[PDB]
């Protein structure tokens, strides 16, 4: 969604992959929190007891059976936490019935997005520009580092591929709500699979160094109704 | 080359000196602690 001051929770999920990965990470961090509490209680009880320890033991070395017990415990624990991770990665890395494509090859210090999948009037591609709004241009109705010249429209309820590349320097297409982020090598070409489920406005930025104007390279996307989106791609 | 007991001479500085009783060299150390970032800012911008 939109970053907020003093936030306490992750933004609303925009794609089913996002909700799935966040839930699986929530379970993983649940396990991580319980083991961290384990270690914390270890440290607390040990220091509290041994701040006045009468005798210092010296002749306990290996305990081979219980040693291999806590040696094989982490292996099975990580395998257990990796099986859902295994199935999640196996499902996410594949693309199942993609519908259309949107591409973003941004130049140096600013973003450029391509809508070649949709035809403006007849055959011709859809292409527009988007530049940052500085403090001088920051008038009544724009946001600093969050408002760009033109927003990026997304087809709601439609499987969408992100064929992303760059021209001069690697530019990071970042949309945290959609759970999408791929560094775009200028010479290479990368695509990922996603689909937006709800209607809303999301903001992004460039989480990869560009140059002098790396900072003022935001990403401003949005979602509208399907007739409105089709009409916008028709007029533009 | 083999006349160092190793009690106070291990430090690469001379403790003796009325002009610098570890007061002028260490004040220079104070100055150079923040000197490089200040001059780096001053070359292109203002502090």
């Amino acid at each position: 969604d939109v970053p907020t001051p003093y936030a306490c929770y992750f933004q609303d999920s925009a794609t089913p992959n996002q909700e799935g990965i966040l839930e699986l990470h929530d379970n993983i961090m649940f396990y991580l929190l319980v083991i961290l509490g384990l270690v914390s209680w270890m440290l607390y009880t040990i220091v509290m007891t041994y701040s006045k320890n009468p005798i210092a033991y010296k002749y306990i070395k290996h305990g081979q059976t219980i040693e291999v017990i806590w040696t094989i415990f982490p292996a099975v624990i990580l395998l257990i936490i990796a099986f859902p991770s295994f199935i999640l990665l196996y499902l996410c890395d594949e693309v199942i019935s993609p519908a259309m494509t949107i591409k973003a090859i941004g130049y140096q210090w600013y973003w450029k997005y391509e809508y070649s999948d949709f035809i403006n009037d007849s055959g011709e591609t859809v292409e527009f520009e988007s530049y940052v709004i500085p403090d001088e241009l920051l008038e009544e109705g724009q946001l600093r580092l969050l408002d760009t010249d033109t927003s990026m429209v997304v087809p709601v309820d439609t499987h969408i591929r992100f064929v992303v590349t760059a021209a001069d320097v690697i530019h990071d297409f970042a949309i945290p709500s959609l759970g999408i982020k791929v560094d775009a090598t200028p010479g290479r070409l990368n695509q990922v699979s996603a689909l937006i489920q709800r209607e809303g406005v999301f903001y992004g930025a460039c989480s990869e160094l560009c140059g002098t104007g790396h900072a003022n390279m935001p990403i401003k996307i949005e979602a509208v109704s399907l007739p409105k989106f089709l009409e916008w791609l028709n007029e533009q | 080359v083999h006349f160092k007991d190793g009690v106070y001479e291990n430090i690469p500085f001379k403790v003796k000196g009325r002009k610098t009783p570890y007061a002028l060299s260490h004040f220079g150390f104070f100055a150079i602690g923040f000197a490089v970032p200040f001059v780096a800012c001053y070359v292109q911008l203002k502090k």
Binding site: P5, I46, I60, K61, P176, A205, C210 | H26, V39
Partner: protein
């Protein structure tokens, strides 16, 4: 009189000189990082008139200075050349000329990097120098060449020091010492030196290739001309991750030595974890590529990389539990080394927890390059390096000087750095979950309060550094007073309820080496007789 401080054939002078250089670099880096955080204290231009070019110039200066001139030189050189050939019974270490050459090629690096940072163009690509991000078109001038030369000379110095340590271990071993039962510090330095010898040359070759690209204007890694910068990216990864091991493992050995010489009990599974550390050193060449999950590798390759990266993560927990057992069943004292080690281990457990959270590849898609990754490595590197160095200094200052250090000043120092680190690092969880966008001179003002508390913690750290230098002055001026009275700790370990006062007085330390009861560093001719052990 100047040959001692310019042509030091003895290792101790070089060790203390490396310590001075590293502490100078560290204080400069801390001050300029305070300046940077003040710039990032509030969005806008309050002290620096924007200048994102300058912003990234000081950002890369921050990173490069602390990585290459604070953590590396002293933390390995001093401990190595002061313990590794001394405890084994060798009379004097070999290759003084090599160490002097390394020292005297260092100022080339310092001056060249200062000039590179102090030019109008400058290099500001950060710790990552992958082209065309590091291209000469944006960062013109001589900055790239000077940085490359500094990289080359620092790599040469570290590689030669590692070679000297390795040959000393292999040849200068005393007759009465088995190889399987070497102390954890010796094996730690052994693994670190071999990993450095197998890692630095690759990065040096890559840096030389980039220098050739920048000078002769050829086409190897530029996007135009059919180049592949991902080769140098992989080279930098296979440097940094083994370099992370290089920075951390000697800290592990130092903590092991501290706990062994303090807790008065053996380390649980000492030989077993010596074998485990050997396995870590042998298998470190397989988990270097868990950061490139998004470059465009195959799914099977992702599976292999993630499998390796969480199958080599068990020994961290093994060491945690082994040191927990080492402090278990024994006597723990309210001394600064105990608390330093405890804080380091706890924050390292959280850092490893975050890393394990990062181990998954599916979550990386929405988690990579977010705030969580930078928070994670700031956690691990910061606590590891800084607390290991602090514990080493506060544990080794009476070993090399013999002049006692105040207990009260040390405790208040620990409390200051500890509270600063906690107040800085606790909100990073919320910062990561919201998605603070990294490396922005003018970030959105939503994170204003968190930036304020981070700036407060950074300023606490800077006043703590002022306390450090004032503590050094206090020691230099009142070591005699500290020896006279009880204002400073006199003995490392407290007696148990078994020992008489006279017996403990004549048995003050029962450790694994004579260094503790070795008199204040003697002349250049020490250990005139071989060490016998049974």
């Amino acid at each position: 009189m100047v040959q001692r401080w310019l042509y030091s054939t003895n290792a101790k002078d070089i060790a203390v000189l490396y310590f001075m250089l590293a502490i100078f670099s560290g204080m400069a880096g801390t001050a300029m990082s305070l300046i940077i955080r003040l710039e990032l204290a509030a969005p806008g231009s309050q002290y620096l008139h924007g200048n994102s070019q300058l912003f990234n110039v000081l950002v890369v200066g921050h990173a490069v200075l602390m990585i290459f001139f604070l953590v590396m030189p002293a933390l390995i050189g001093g401990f190595g050349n002061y313990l590794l050939p001394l405890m084994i019974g060798a009379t004097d270490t070999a290759f003084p000329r090599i160490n002097n050459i390394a020292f005297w090629v260092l100022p080339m690096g310092l001056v060249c990097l200062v000039t590179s940072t102090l030019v109008e163009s400058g290099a500001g690509t950060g710790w990552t120098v992958y082209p065309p991000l590091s291209s000469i078109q944006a960062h013109s001038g001589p900055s790239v060449d000077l940085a490359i030369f500094a990289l080359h000379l620092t790599s040469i110095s570290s590689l030669l020091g590692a070679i000297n340590f390795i040959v000393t271990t292999l040849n200068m071993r005393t007759n009465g010492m088995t190889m399987h039962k070497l102390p954890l510090f010796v094996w730690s330095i052994f693994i670190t030196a071999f990993l450095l010898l197998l890692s630095l040359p690759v990065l040096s070759a890559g840096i030389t290739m980039l220098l050739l690209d920048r000078n002769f204007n050829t086409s190897f890694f530029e996007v135009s001309g059919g180049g592949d910068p991902i080769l140098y990216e992989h080279l930098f990864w296979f440097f940094g991750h083994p370099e992370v091991y290089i920075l951390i493992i000697p800290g592990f050995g130092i903590i092991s030595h501290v706990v062994s010489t303090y807790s008065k009990k053996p380390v649980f599974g000492e030989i077993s974890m010596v074998y485990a550390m050997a396995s870590i050193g042998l298998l470190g060449f397989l988990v270097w590529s868990h950061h490139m999950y998004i470059v465009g590798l195959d799914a099977d390759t992702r599976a292999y990389f993630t499998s390796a990266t969480m199958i080599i993560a068990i020994p961290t927990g093994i060491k945690i539990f082994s040191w927990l057992a080492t402090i278990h069943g024994g006597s723990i004292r309210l001394a600064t080394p105990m608390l330093y080690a405890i804080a380091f281990l706890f924050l390292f457990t959280m850092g490893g927890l975050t890393g394990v959270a990062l181990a998954n590849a599916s979550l990386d898609v929405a988690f990579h390059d977010t705030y969580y990754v930078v928070g994670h490595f700031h956690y691990v590197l910061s606590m590891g390096a800084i607390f290991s160095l602090f514990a080493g200094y506060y544990y080794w200052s009476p070993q090399i000087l013999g002049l006692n250090y105040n207990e009260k000043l040390a405790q208040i120092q620990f409390w200051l750095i500890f509270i600063g680190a906690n107040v800085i690092f606790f909100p990073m969880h919320f910062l990561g979950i919201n998605g603070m966008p990294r490396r922005i001179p003018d970030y959105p003002d939503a994170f204003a309060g968190w930036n304020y508390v981070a700036s407060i913690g950074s300023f606490i750290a800077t006043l703590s550094l002022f306390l450090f230098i004032y503590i050094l002055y206090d020691q230099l001026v009142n070591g005699l007073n500290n020896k006279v009275n009880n204002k400073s700790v006199i003995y490392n370990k407290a007696p148990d309820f078994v020992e008489s006062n006279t017996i403990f007085n004549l048995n003050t330390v029962k450790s694994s080496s004579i260094e503790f009861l070795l008199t204040s560093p003697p002349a250049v001719h020490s250990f005139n007789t071989p060490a016998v052990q049974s």
